[model samples]
Target: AMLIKPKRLQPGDIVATVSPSWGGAGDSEIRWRYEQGVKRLEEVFGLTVVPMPNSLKGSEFIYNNPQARAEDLMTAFQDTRVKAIIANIGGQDSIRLLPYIDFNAIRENPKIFMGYADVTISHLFCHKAGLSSFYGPAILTDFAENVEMDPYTVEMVNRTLFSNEMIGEIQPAPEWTSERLEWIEINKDTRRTMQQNNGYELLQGSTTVQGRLIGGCIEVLEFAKGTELWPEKKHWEDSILFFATSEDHPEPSYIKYWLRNYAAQGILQKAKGIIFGKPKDEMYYEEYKHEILQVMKEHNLEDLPILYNLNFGATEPKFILPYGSMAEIDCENGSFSILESGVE
Candidate 1:
């Protein structure tokens, strides 16, 4: 399918915030985080972020009515004034939105759509409709980070959504955190403890490789596998498949199992290389690395370019990976470049 890249955001662009997945954005307890994130969007990024009527609603209502979640999405896209749509946070059952989506509405009016984890559901939905969507941050989790947003995350947003220039090589956060802290109003000003980072680790091959980048949370992609949203065989050709686990922190064995699914499905065989996010909190940090090597070896993909701990998904130092953009893996220099702009 021909890719439909969205337009990048400008300083005055208006971004519509929607809770397409979890509904906790509306809870009084966490609304402070939502407010802080929105504040950053306006003050830090200089983009106006607003919410549709149905967004940031109660968790129970969002869970009960997936249609309402879908409505906010359609409302965002159809509104010509809105230049982008950002999710509030990730959740598991965004799949429930499939029955309610207007794919043509998305195709008819393509724009910046960014989020990760369960937001994968909507990204894939956009893919099926031949539009580019970002595997990036939600408002509360990354933007509303305690006190202020991370500099790396700020650059990621600006480089991907705001600037038209190609985002060059991606590097590891010098210091990072996976420590989840209270998003309560009382702790609104408190910050998460950041620790030193070891930089990207090479789990396989040591040469350069480049391709159109694709993939998101593997666990979320599991939900999309049998469904029509999963990209076809041709789409996997020469593409770098990236993954990062959610807070669930699946065990090494589970990682081994699921990656084998990729091999069995002919993905790892045809794909150019791989990039794995720093294991959350470094939980299974070493073990997950071993499991990835084990799985690739099982498929005898001994030469596949594999990069681990390159931050992007479900982690604190937020970086945006453009779904259909070109990525270069230069193992010789320990560098990864997002070679193409995600938008026109």
Candidate 2:
């Protein structure tokens, strides 16, 4: 089945924020951080950002009421005033909302839905709903960065979600940071230092590969297995699998086991290519690349293309990836591009 691309965002568009996972934004202590993100959306993008009814209900209430979170998502989709929905932040246990998702609301009212980490679970729900959702930054995290939002993130957000043209040539961010500063009033004016990006590396294959994009935080994906949200082998066919690590920064050996599962399911062989985001803080950078190549070799998938160190996910100054969108990875040039507009 073909996935639906939502309409492109406009200056006056009304975007809603939802707490599909963590409700930290609602806590009185950090609520100011949430407001900072909303202010950025309004001033920088010229859009009206509003929070859903239950999105700001604090961590305790949100942790106990997955149905309320699910309702917030459904209401955003159903509301005519809302043009897009952004997640507050990623958290564990978003899988709990699975039972309450209304696929029809998402399918019939397709719009931009973006977030990463545990939000990967929500992206899978969007996939099952047959709608394209973005795997990108969250309001409380990216937009609420201490000093300012990463410029790369700002540009990518514009090019992918606001513009109707093709997103050509995804280049590496000039700089990046994985420094974790406490989100508090004291550090609100402090800025994280940046380091030069190492650009994308082609691990294997000589030919360019094109396919519909699919994948998310590898850790979050473990929970989806055997669930209704897990994509079948058919879905893996011709997919450009993109994955990144979370702040949890799991061991490289654990990553090997995860890839082994994919190989066992023939997913590595089925995918057109794989694009891995830079690990958080570049933890196990070289180690991860080695393990990925080793896994492919073990599965006799040397022909499958692998691109590493591209900027996105759990890293500052990240870019957005629209799931189910047509994308091309040029192994020869070590370049990646979205062939289709993320939005209509």
Candidate 3:
């Protein structure tokens, strides 16, 4: 399969941050963290952060003006000045702005688009528009991480955005953090402590399958299903590595419901293999695991390689993946690896 790599970004590159989904930055408490995030983008990445006109206007304003968000995204894509695009944060209604977006414009001037969680809508649309985008941490969430950019995330970004090799090893983070630390306490420089992780656990299958990497936060994608953002069943066939992650916001039962639908739609059957991100909270791990395996058994897909994320918080410590890169799954060894790096 042909893969398109968006322009690589450097320290001096100009990056645009826009709130394409829920405008969570409207709160005064969180607004400061958002500002801190932007500062980190400049100080750490050495990139100039350009804020869209509607970026900080609050949820009501952004939600009511989805066109403005769409315009901001289109503007960034068309502007030769901007080297890459990053989402400020993910919200609930990003899907609403899809209708207003100019897909042609994005397809014509594809650039690095990074963000995950609710931003899954944008990632799916970018794929449909024939552009390769990132499914990673957001500016406010990961960049402004209390401790720092999770080393795993930092390395993944560097490999995907800067390097030109085929990144091929996936390992679990030595330490992980899922604890939510309040940003309200400014004096508390560090957000929270992290715990040791067990790396990636193999779910099933023993053969290696290769295809373009795709999929994202399962909950968010489900919300956009049947809409224009939903990729057709055929699209999954092009996806060699179908990665799915869970968000802390959704209940375990909800996760199972959506995964079953993924199988029902024939997506699970068509995929070469599957990768599941670590559940944010461990409360529902058992139920979630059972449901996932149950669905796999029903489809006789228990043999497919199923990789699990082994980190916490916005930083995926253990394994960093390159979007649109080649990956292999070895259920026999209970492991997976990237066959090639995603960078150009």
TM-score for each predicted model, relative to the true structure:
0.97, 0.98, 0.91
Q: Global lDDT for candidate 2?
A: 0.90
For residues 290-310, write the lDDT of model 2, one tens digit per residue.
Answer: 888899889899988889988
Error of 1 at 150 (Å): 0.7
**Residue ranges of candidate 2 with Cα displaced over 4 Å:** none
Query: What's the distance in Å from true for residue 51, model 1?
Result: 0.4
RMSD (Å) per prediction: 1.2, 1.0, 2.3
Query: Which structure among the candidates has the greatest lDDT?
Result: 2
For every model in order, what is the number of clashing pairs? Answer: 0, 0, 9
Model 1: which residue pairs collide?
A: none
Q: Candidate order by TM-score, highest to lowest?
A: 2, 1, 3
**So what's the TM-score on candidate 3?**
0.91
Lowest lDDT block of 10, candidate 3: 312-321
Candidate 1 displacement at residue 179 in angstroms: 1.5
Please give, for residues 1-344, the per-residue lDDT of candidate 3 as tens digits. 44467767788889888889877675666787787778777887788988877777887888899888888888888898888888888777788887788778888887888887778888876777878787767777777777567777777777777767767766566777767777674734875777777767766667766666777777777778888777655567746544455455466667678878877887777788877777775556566677778878877888766766544224445344445666777666666677865656
